[PDB]
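Quick log. Single chain, no ligands specified.
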Amino acid sequence: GSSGSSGVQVGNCLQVMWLADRHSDPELYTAAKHCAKTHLAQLQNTEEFLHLPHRLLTDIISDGVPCSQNPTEAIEAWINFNKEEREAFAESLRTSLKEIGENVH
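-> predicted structure:
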């Protein structure tokens, strides 16, 4: 019957992937990190995500994000937090931002 084990969840994906990266953990970091890029919104509407650094966020969006989960929206917010300086990261992040799914070269 319906049986499984403890793994990763879009909700606790950030926290997981975070520590993982800090502990040079590719297996985990990659896993959680992925689920994040796919479900960025679910995190963009949360504090943690906005509380995350630039290295983490950059990596996520760097791995390409599905047009489905409004990527820019998350960038604008996570940036607005401390736009005072993050601004620089906002522009650079925008140009770096990548979209998948749609047929565009």
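The domain at 12-105 is CATH 1.25.40.420 (Serine Threonine Protein Phosphatase 5, Tetratricopeptide repeat).
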